């Protein structure tokens, strides 16, 4: 990805939008009970914390585009996830637009806490004034569309979330590029079929894991891995995704009956933002927050790691390559060790960055017991191996902890924490009680105790 310009939205015929700079997050009643460092992310050019233009720092993530064409791997990469696709018999009809707005079987109701983006926001209209849960009214919505059409500008707003002391100097915050919800209605009719049938088959068959849950899934990924794992991260994935990349995710598209709507991928590929009082052009680089994005970049994903492995070991049997990704997160296998610093060589060629799994220093033999996905490792139970426990390490969830958005939520914040740290054993977990209650508000909270998680895991298979 990369800025093509950059300039004052009144000069192209656009409002100024007003964004948040105060942090919503404080140090909760658990601050001094558990060790952390992160804090707020920057969310504005004067923040005192600040090390380095902020502006400058929020938008370095766009390195450019390496490729401008669909090279024969790629193309051979398309065909083969295209033929697998293939064999889930997606529905390619188009969802009208009661089920797009408010859910169906395999595709949750749009969410109506967050941004309705431009011109809504700058119209002070909420959601809510649209939707209507009870009613499944798409009159107001309707109306919306054939008033402000599609292809509006996406709006640009700082992540209010935790973040390292060094990305907080650095101001290295993190960006929501939010969809009008026009845009979102219109792509979810578009491809509402293909979320649902993604979500619905979590797997190596859509080689992704959106919408899946941890709890039940863990216990299915190994049966699905081959023999010899391989990982790897990248270093800011959607934006360094360069048009080509997009153009292959049309050919896919078309492949399995879309080609009736690959324009809205361009929409993601060349795309205009909203930022403050400027407005600016993205070649290449996925939207943070359109309707879809975890899914094309999950889909995208299983187009490079194909193209890189096509591209390093040529004869390679991608119908023996398992991989599930959820966006740039991935955990994939192979019958044959592969080398993961070849792969990640061959990927700068694509415009990727790829180094060693989980912040390792070098590249290492992924193991079924190193590996992770979601953050999660991967646990047999000591009582029924056959049942795997997803394991999120304690650090993250104290990190958490130490801090609130709203008072009111602390319960289930709180209680979200809780089905994330069992799986790392009873007496870790009732270490974790114990502090939680050696404060007034944690006493007063309705935490489940260990058994009856383990009991209730038991009975969710
Ligand atoms: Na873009």
């Given at each position: ?356 799994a989980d912040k390792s220093a070098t590249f290492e033999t992924v193991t079924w017991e190193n590996v992770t996905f979601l953050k999660r490792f991967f ?13 999120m390490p304690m650090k993250e969830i104290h990190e958490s902890i130490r801090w609130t958005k709203d008072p009111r939520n602390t319960q289930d914040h ?39 998680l383990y009991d209730r895991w038991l009975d969710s298979f």
């Amino acid at each position: 990805g990369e800025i093509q310009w950059m300039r004052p939205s009144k000069e192209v015929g656009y409002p100024i939008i007003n964004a948040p700079s105060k942090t919503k997050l404080e140090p909760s009643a658990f601050h001094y009970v558990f060790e952390g460092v992160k804090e707020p992310a920057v969310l504005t050019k004067n923040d005192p914390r600040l090390k380095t233009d902020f502006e400058e720092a929020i938008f370095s993530k766009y390195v450019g585009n390496k490729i401008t064409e669909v090279d024969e791997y790629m193309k051979e990469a398309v065909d083969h996830y295209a033929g697998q696709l293939m064999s889930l018999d997606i529905n390619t009809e188009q969802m009208c637009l009661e089920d797009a707005m408010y859910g169906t079987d395999g595709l949750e109701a749009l969410d109506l806490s967050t941004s309705a983006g431009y011109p809504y926001v700058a119209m002070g209209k909420k959601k809510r004034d649209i939707l209507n849960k009870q009613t499944r009214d798409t009159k107001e919505m309707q109306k919306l569309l054939d008033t402000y059409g599609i292809n509006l500008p996406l709006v640009t707003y700082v992540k209010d979330e935790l973040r390292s002391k060094t990305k907080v100097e650095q101001g290295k915050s993190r960006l929501i590029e939010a969809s009008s919800l026009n845009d979102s209605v219109a792509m979810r009719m578009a491809f509402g079929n293909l979320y649902a049938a993604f979500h619905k088959n979590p797997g190596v068959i859509t080689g992704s894991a959106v919408g899946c849950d941890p709890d039940l899934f863990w216990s299915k990924i190994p049966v699905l891995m081959e023999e010899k794992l391989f990982a790897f991260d990248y270093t800011g994935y959607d934006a360094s995704l360069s048009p080509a990349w997009f153009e292959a995710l049309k050919m896919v598209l078309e492949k399995i009956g879309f080609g009736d709507r690959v324009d809205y991928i361009d929409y993601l590929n060349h795309s205009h933002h909203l930022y403050k009082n400027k407005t600016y052009c993205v070649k290449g680089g996925m939207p943070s927050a359109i309707s879809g994005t975890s899914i094309f970049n999950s889909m995208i994903n299983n187009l490079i790691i194909r193209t890189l492995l096509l591209k390093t070991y040529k004869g390679i049997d991608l119908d023996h390559l398992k991989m599930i990704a959820y966006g740039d997160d991935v955990i994939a296998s192979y019958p044959h060790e592969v080398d993961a610093s070849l792969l990640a060589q061959s990927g700068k060629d694509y415009g990727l960055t790829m180094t060693p799994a989980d912040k390792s220093a070098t590249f290492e033999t992924v193991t079924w017991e190193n590996v992770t996905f979601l953050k999660r490792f991967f646990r047999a139970d000591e009582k029924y191996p056959f049942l795997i426990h997803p394991v999120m390490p304690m650090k993250e969830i104290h990190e958490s902890i130490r801090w609130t958005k709203d008072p009111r939520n602390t319960q289930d914040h709180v209680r979200s924490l809780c089905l994330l740290a069992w799986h790392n054993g009873e007496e870790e977990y009732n270490k974790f009680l114990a502090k939680i209650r050696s404060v007034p508000i944690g006493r007063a909270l309705d935490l489940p105790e260990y058994s009856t998680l383990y009991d209730r895991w038991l009975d969710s298979f």
